[PDB]
Symmetry: C3
Subunit: 340 residues, 3 copies
C-alpha cells in the first residue's frame, strides 16, 4: 500500500541551501532517513549509496563538528572528499564564486559550502550544476537543525515534533536562531525566542515563519521575559553570543545585554519541568578551558558565558548526542540528494 | 607504437615538457581522451589501486589540487594534501631530505611551488615519480589540458595544423610552457606582449631548434593586430603571477592593458570561429577582492579579459578546466599505473 | 597478548610492559614484510580515524595517513588552523565529539596532560604522535631500525648514545625505552639539559629489573666508547623559544655529531641515527640563519656524517610508518 519512492524521486539532485526551500514532508523524510542510517551503521548493515562519488568541502570559516560529520558520512557511504580550508585556495581573493562553482561542478559530484553571505551559497547552488549543501552561512544553519530535531525526537517518549515545546535563549538573530525558527514553523512546533529585543530575528523572516506556522499549527513567541518564555519547555537551547565572522568588539556590546539569558540551573527550574533537556549546537563557552572563553569571562567576572558548567555537564545536557547526530543527518542529506 | 610510448613512460617524472618527445606528448593527450571517455561511460579501470600519493603545495591552488585529488580517487589511489603551512618543508627540512622521506612512504609525489630547481631536486632524490603541478618557470599539466581542449574544439585538425596566440606576460610559467608545447607539436604560436616580458632568449633559442624539426613556427611581437590575424585560439593569463610582489601591479597594468583580450581583439583575428582560452583563475570583473581593487585603481571593468569575451560563446575556459583532471590522470596512469 | 592491547590508548611507553613493546616491534616487522611482499591484510577496513596536529609535521602525519590507507581506513587531518580546538572548544569537549564520530584519534601537540585528557574522555583509542614530554611512536621505529641493522642481536645486547638535549621528548622516550628493553644507553650532553631526576630514577628502577644500564655524562669520549649507534636531534624543539638558540648553541656545540665523534666510538660499524628533521647544512631557512649567526656549517650533525655510509636516517624514517601501523592494528584492528 504505502511503500513509495515519489518523495525520494523529488529529493534527487536538489541542493540543501536552507529549510525554507523544503516542505514539511521533505524535512520529515530527511529526519526518518537519518534514523535509518544511524541504525544501519550501529547494526553493521549500512549500504554504500555514494560509491565512487567525489565531494568537495569548502570551508571559508573554521569547523570541527560540521567538517568531520561531512567527512565521516562520505567515508561510510563509499565517497571520497577534498577538504578546502580557509587558506590555500583561490576562492574569493583570486577567483569569483561563479567561476569556482563551474570548475568544481565539472570535477566533483557534490559540493558543501560553509562561509559568509547566504547569497554566496545561493550563487554556488545556481552555477555548480551538481548538488550543493549549506554547512553554515551568516543567515542559516540547516544541517544543524535537522540534527537537533532528530535529537529531540529521540529524547522524547511518544511525541512527534508537532507536540514539542522549546526555547532558544540569547542571540536570536544568528544563523542557528533563524534556522530553529524556520524549522519549528515548518514542523508545527512551539518555539519561544527569548533574548534582548535588539537581537530578535528580522521582521520579514518572522512574518514569513508566522505565515508558515499558521498552516502547520506551530506557534512562535518572541519575548524578553525568561520565566514566561521557558515555562513548560521540553528543551532549552542556546549558542555563543558572538558568532564567527563578527568583530571581537561585539563582546563589549553584548555581554551585559545577554547575561540575564544565561542558561543556568535557575533557568531550568523556571521551566517547572523536571524532565527538561539542555541543547547547544557547540562549540560552547562554559568554563575557562578555551582561550576566548576564559578571557571574556575573566573580563566580566563570570565563570561560563551562555551556559554554566553545572548545566552543561548535568544529566539534563544532551549536547554530545546532538553532536553525533550531525553526522547521521548530513549523511541523510547526501544520500537523498546524490545517492544512487 | 602507442604500446612503445606507454612502455617508455613508466616510472618517469613529469617535470617539464622539455623532458618528453613529440610522440610521448601525443600519447599522453590520446590517453587523456581515452580516460575521459571511460569515466563518462562508467568503464574506467583503476590502475592506481592501493597506491598512495603525496600532494605538496607551496602556493595556493583550486583547479590543480582538485584535479590531482579527483584523478587519484577515480583511479583507486589515496592522497595526502600538504599545504603551504603545517609541514616541516623549507623552514625546518631541506627538499633533499623531504624527498627521501616521502619517497619511502608514498608511490608518487606532486609538487607546486617556486623555482624549477626545487622540483628538479625533488625529482632527483625521491626515487618515485614526481609531477610538476606548477613552478615559476613551467606549468606542464596545464598545456596538456590546453592541447586536448584545442583538439576537441577543432574539426579534424591535428595540433600541427593549429595557429594560436598568447597575450600578455609571455615569460610567465604558462607562456613558457605554451611555447615549448607548440614547438614540440609543430604548431604556429604567436607570443604577443611587451618586449620586456618576452620569454628568455635561451628558452626561445631551444624552442626554435625544436620547431625546425617539427615544422612549428614561433613569432614574438608587440603588435596585437599582427600577432592574432588568422588565429584559431586566443589565450591569456593574469598579468602578475603568484609569488611576485603585489607591488608589481602598480606599474604593470598600464603596460599590459593594450594586450587585454576584448571583442576588438577577437575581431582582429578575421576568424568567426575563433575560440578563447585562459588557464584560470581570471580577473574578468569586480567579483574578486584583488580583481576589483586593481581594476578600480585604473577605472577598468576587467583586466586581462573582459566579461563580454569570457562569458561569450567563443569562450571554452570551463571545458579547458575540466580537461585538467583528465590530463593529470593520464600523467599519473602512464608513469605509475599498472 | 594481542587481546590485551585491544582498545588501549598509546600515550607513552611507561604505560606498557617489556613484552608488549616487543610484540609491537615484532608486529611492525611482520606488517613491513607483508607490504613488501604484497600480501598485506586490511584489518582497519571501514574504520575512520582523526589526526589532530597542533604542531607541524611531515613524517608523523604521513606515516599515520599511509598506514591507515594501506589498512583500509580513512583519515581526517585537522591541522593547527581551521578547527575550533583550543581557542573556541575545550579538549574535553573535542574528545567527546570526535569519539562519537571516529574509531580512533591521533594527537600531536603540547603538554602530555592534554593527550592524557583526550585519552580519558574520547572513549576510543588515542595515540600520542608527539608531546613536549614524550614521543613514543618514534622510539618504536628506532628500535625496529636498530634490530634490522644489527646482526642477530636482541635489543638487550645493544649499546647506544644520545647526544645533545637529553631532556627533550625524544631523549626522555629513548631513556624509558632503553630501560624497558634492557639496553645500555648513554645520555651525553650538558648537565643542565639532562632529564628530570624523577624520570631518571623511575627508569633506573625499571632497568634494574631488565638488566639495562643508564649513564648520564658530559664527557663525549666516555659516553660514546663502544656504541653500536649514535643518535641526536635538534637542540631546540618545536614550541620552545627561538631565543633558546642564544642560550644553547655554545653549550651544545661540543656535542655535535661529527666524524671525530664517530671515531671516538672505536667502532668501524657504528651507525648514525636522527629522528629528523635535521639541521645539517644551509638548505633550510632556520638552519641557515642559526648556523650563519654562530659561524657553523651544520648544527647537531655535520653534512659529512648525515650523508655518510654510516647514516641510516632514511631507513629509520620509513620505519615510522610500519610501527604506527602496528600500533593502530594492535589497538583497533579486527
Ligand atoms: N555546530 C555548529 O555547526 N556550530 C557552529 C557555530 C555557530 C555559531 N552561531 C556561529 O555562526 O559561530
Ligand atoms: N590553471 C592553473 O593551474 N593556474 C595557476 C596560475 C598560473 C599563473 N601564471 C601563476 O603562476 O600565478
Ligand atoms: N621525527 C619526528 O617526529 N620528529 C619530530 C620533532 C621532534 C623534536 N624533538 C621536536 O619536538 O621538535
Ligand atoms: Cl535553514
Ligand atoms: Cl613545460
Ligand atoms: Cl614514551
Amino acid at each position: 500500500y504505502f511503500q513509495s519512492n515519489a518523495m525520494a524521486f523529488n529529493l534527487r539532485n536538489r541542493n540543501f541551501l536552507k529549510l525554507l526551500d523544503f516542505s514539511t514532508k521533505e524535512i520529515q523524510f530527511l529526519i526518518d532517513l537519518s534514523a535509518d542510517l544511524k541504525k544501519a551503521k550501529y547494526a553493521g548493515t549500512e549500504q554504500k549509496k555514494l560509491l565512487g562519488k567525489n565531494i568537495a568541502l569548502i570551508f571559508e570559516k573554521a569547523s570541527t563538528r560540521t567538517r568531520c560529520a561531512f567527512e565521516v558520512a562520505a567515508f561510510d557511504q563509499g565517497a571520497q572528499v577534498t577538504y578546502i580550508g580557509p587558506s590555500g585556495s583561490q576562492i574569493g581573493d583570486k577567483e569569483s564564486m561563479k567561476d569556482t562553482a563551474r570548475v568544481l561542478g565539472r570535477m566533483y559530484d557534490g559540493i558543501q559550502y560553509r562561509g559568509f553571505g547566504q547569497a554566496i551559497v545561493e550563487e554556488l547552488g545556481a552555477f555548480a550544476g551538481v548538488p550543493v549543501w549549506n554547512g553554515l552561512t551568516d543567515e542559516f544553519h540547516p544541517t544543524q537543525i535537522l540534527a537537533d530535531f532528530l535529537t529531540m525526537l529521540e529524547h522524547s517518549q511518544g511525541k512527534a515534533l508537532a507536540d514539542i515545546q522549546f526555547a532558544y535563549l540569547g542571540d536570536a538573530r544568528n544563523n542557528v536562531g533563524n534556522s530553529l525558527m524556520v524549522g519549528a514553523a515548518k514542523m508545527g512546533m512551539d518555539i519561544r525566542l527569548v533574548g534582548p529585543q535588539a537581537y530578535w530575528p528580522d521582521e520579514e523572516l518572522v512574518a514569513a515563519c508566522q505565515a508558515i506556522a499558521k498552516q502547520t499549527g506551530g506557534k512562535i513567541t518572541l519575548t524578553e521575559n525568561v520565566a514566561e518564555g521557558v515555562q513548560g519547555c521540553d528543551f532549552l537551547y542556546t549558542d555563543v553570543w558572538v558568532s564567527m565572522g563578527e568583530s571581537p568588539e561585539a563582546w563589549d556590546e553584548r555581554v551585559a545585554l545577554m547575561k540575564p539569558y544565561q542558561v543556568n540551573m535557575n533557568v531550568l527550574k523556571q521551566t517547572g519541568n523536571p524532565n527538561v533537556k539542555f541543547m547547544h549546537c557547540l562549540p560552547a563557552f562554559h568554563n575557562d578551558e578555551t582561550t576566548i572563553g576564559k578571557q571574556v569571562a575573566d573580563k566580566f567576572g563570570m565563570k561560563g558565558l551562555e551556559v554554566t558548567e553545572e548545566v552543561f555537564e548535568s544529566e539534563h545536557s544532551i549536547v554530545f548526542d546532538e553532536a553525533e547526530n550531525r553526522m547521521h543527518t548530513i549523511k541523510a542529506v547526501m544520500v537523498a540528494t546524490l545517492g544512487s
